[PDB]
């Protein structure tokens, strides 16, 4: 009872939202390299037996919509759920190609009561984005 | 007999709160590239939390920024694991 049941027919989905290009009216430098990360993830998760679904350059609305729909799917036969977000961001905020969106709004779709098929199942959210503008100068060892 | 609606969630941030997250032009973000490498090497013998701890050490120790602008030069990064899980996670 110490380990999550991972012997379901399917390991689960693996949504990867890859954002590289942003609207000129936002002030975001194209995230060069995120293509390598997206591809690296895909292969890594495919080995872990996940149904990987990649998505590129999404807007606020599109992001929220993709998540809303995925949360409305039937995960009954799945053992978990992973979501990878690669983009610009601030504290508790993921950036869509056109505008920002709270990470909370996204995660709330997968809560125990808004998605019964995932209740009691691990919901992993890997986030590659900024959380502010502080620089860690580090210290020698 | 019920559970919190916020339980069983696990967030793997690439950096600490209030901090920047670094990315390489050709290799890809430090976080993702370390995360994938650790998964490829330990996802068959280590629990997820233990794997992410490895990811933290790799990112904190083997990476340092480089820039012609002093302001962004020689900077470090530490990933932030935020777990509301209630059991151990194994990918197998």
């Amino acid at each position: 009872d110490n380990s999550y049941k991972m012997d379901y027919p399917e390991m689960g989905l693996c949504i990867i939202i890859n954002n590289k290009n942003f609207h000129k009216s936002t002030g975001m430098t194209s995230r060069s390299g995120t293509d390598v990360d997206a591809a690296n993830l895909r292969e890594t998760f495919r080995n872990l037996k996940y149904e990987v679904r990649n998505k590129n350059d999404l807007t606020r609305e599109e992001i929220v919509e993709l998540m809303r729909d995925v949360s409305k799917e039937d995960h009954s036969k799945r053992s978990s759920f992973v979501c990878v977000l690669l983009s610009h961001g601030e504290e508790g905020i993921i950036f869509g190609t056109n505008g920002p969106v709270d990470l909370k709004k996204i995660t709330n779709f997968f809560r125990g009561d808004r998605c019964r098929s995932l209740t009691g199942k691990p919901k992993l959210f890997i986030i590659q984005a900024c959380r502010g503008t502080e620089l860690d100068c580090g210290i020698e060892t | 007999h019920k559970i919190p609606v916020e339980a069983d969630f696990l967030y793997a941030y690439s950096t600490a709160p209030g901090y920047y997250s670094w990315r390489n032009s050709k290799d890809g973000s430090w976080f993702i590239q370390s995360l994938c490498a650790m998964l490829k090497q330990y996802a068959d013998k280590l629990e997820f939390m233990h794997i992410l701890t490895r990811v933290n050490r790799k990112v904190a120790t083997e990476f340092e920024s480089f820039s012609f602008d002093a302001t962004f030069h020689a900077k470090k990064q530490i990933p932030c694991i935020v777990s509301m899980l209630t059991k151990e996670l194994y990918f197998y």
């Binding site: 060069s32 610009h88 | 920047y20």
Partner: peptide, 4 residues
């Protein structure tokens, strides 16, 4: 080189 760059940041997010």
């Amino acid at each position: 080189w760059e940041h997010d």
